[model samples]
Target chain A: AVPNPPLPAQDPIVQHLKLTNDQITRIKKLHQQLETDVSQISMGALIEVIKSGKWDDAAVKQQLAAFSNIEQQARYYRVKYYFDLSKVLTPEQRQQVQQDLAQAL
Target chain B: AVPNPPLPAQDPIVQHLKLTNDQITRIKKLHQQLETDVSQISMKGIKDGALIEVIKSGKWDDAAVKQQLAAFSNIEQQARYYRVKYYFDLSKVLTPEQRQQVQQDLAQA
Candidate 1:
């Protein structure tokens, strides 16, 4: 097998949001709490369509809906992550970040 | 039946590259040539992802699995080509100054 490239340990969000290690451990702690929170079993949803051999649109839609909730949960963590990140940066640093993005864009 | 929602006719890369409408139109035409062109093959990726999930969850028929996986891999491979084409085509529309802006944002990480 070809050697796999070393995977990045941290989320790109850390750098993109201009976050740091002190925040990473803490922000990560927050994200984990969200994962533990759940709306429905993915396996149960998976089984619904499997039993039918074709999509039961209701099952498929339920899965998407359930995923959407999880997606929203992830965003909540992201929004909070940004919130925590915003608290760390000075007003000047934030301005610099925006300038960097526009220039970098 | 709940209708499947329509997707973007345009590439999101438009806003990311800070491309102009004329630029977007031209890049798109370049891409049309490309689709005809390995012309290869994310969200587009996600479609394949759901397939494998079905493979396992449904215990899909064996006869179809290998065929479907290869077809899915080919689809993904083709998409990779389209992405490369967009990168080249969109960059053709820019001044170094414009290219610098996006790369700088990228380097900000």
Candidate 2:
């Protein structure tokens, strides 16, 4: 029988998010908080935040201000994920994705 | 002499949507109807409708139902376009011209 390679540790999208060890740990913690606080939050929101600059905010006030709402944080992460993934896409693919996103919005 | 060419008329994603002539025509009509019906609607409402299945419904609503609809128009169009474009992009290769366009969009973004 052919040996199967182990599944990748992370999805391409998650890999592209290029999360640092600390960031990943922080995200995991935040995700747990989100699960309890906003169980109904969509996966898309999480993706958006990760793709945007939400995690990059340095100032406590700015970080607090940026993700003040659970729903807002979800959206920020969701778009942040997309933005990161978009870097991997070709120009046409990126444009296509943008158009699709626009239409979706 | 090298040709100084005209730009491509269609985007690969748009082209890939390959919206059948019938579908395109229908979409245009639907968009017009949506614009008229939802003029007062919020951007979020329009987006939600497009993403899902507002047009697929058989019944008319007494008021704009605002329920998740599950087939909202904006999300539907966005997702549909993504679905169609995904096939074109699976190879992850681009022509020279496409690379230039990519760089431009990147700079702009």
Candidate 3:
């Protein structure tokens, strides 16, 4: 379980990361933007194509590029989020958090 | 519709991905090795219900594992893309039965 889905912004992970409420809200918003983007531009199209099974590489590939943006955006915030969380703990705590996350993942 | 074909050992989506049969078999071997390597590095030698021990025992890692986890981050990211692409293929490329299966699965998701 080394790659679990991220916890909700409102969850303890927010506190555990030591982010302020305002920062956590922003993180959640950033993730929200990701969901909406994926839904509208990527997933919405893909599901229809999948169920219908109609694909033009020209079209599908275009939508795929949109998802790559989501990937990039999500990664930027996640690094900052985790980087801060990394600093919150001592070496030993960091180790446990790794184990914690690995198993949780 | 494509013909029903034999299963491959690798990613299980080779047919959908349009990967060649040779590639499927070759990648299967590699996937097996990669999977084993991931488990071998965990704090617990065993994974079965071992999370509790990791919790109670307070198992931790250092900078190396942190970077390892970063690379590990790619695992899920890459996986998600494959699935999205695969389903997109399966929904259309597969036969009636397979496509129906994806329809149900995608619906649940």
Number of clashes recorded per candidate: 13, 37, 5
**In candidate 3, how many Å is residue A18 off?**
15
Off by over 4 Å in 2: A1-68, B1-109
lDDT tens digits, residue span B1-109, model 1: 1111111145443455656777667766776666654343322432333322332233444434334434444444444334333443445566676655533432332
Provide chain B's TM-score, model 2.
0.25
What would the TM-score be for candidate 1 when compared with the true structure? 0.31
lDDT score of residue B99 within candidate 3 = 67
User: Interface Cα RMSD for all candidates?
Assistant: 22.2, 17.5, 8.0
Query: What fraction of the true interface does each of the listed models get right, in terms of native contacts kept?
Result: 0.00, 0.00, 0.20
Poorest stretch of ten by lDDT in candidate 3 chain A: A1-10
How do all the candidates rank in terms of TM-score, highest first?
Answer: 3, 1, 2
Please write out the lDDT profile of model 1 over residues A1-105, one tens digit for every residue. Answer: 001111113543234555566755665665565445422324233332222233444554454455444444343333333334444555654555334333322
CAPRI verdict on model 1?
incorrect
Model 3 chain B: lowest-lDDT 10 consecutive positions: B1-10
Q: Which candidate number would show the highest DockQ if scored against the true structure? A: 3
lDDT of 2 by residue, B72-104 (tens): 433433333322222223212444443344333
**TM-score of candidate 3 relative to the true fold:** 0.39
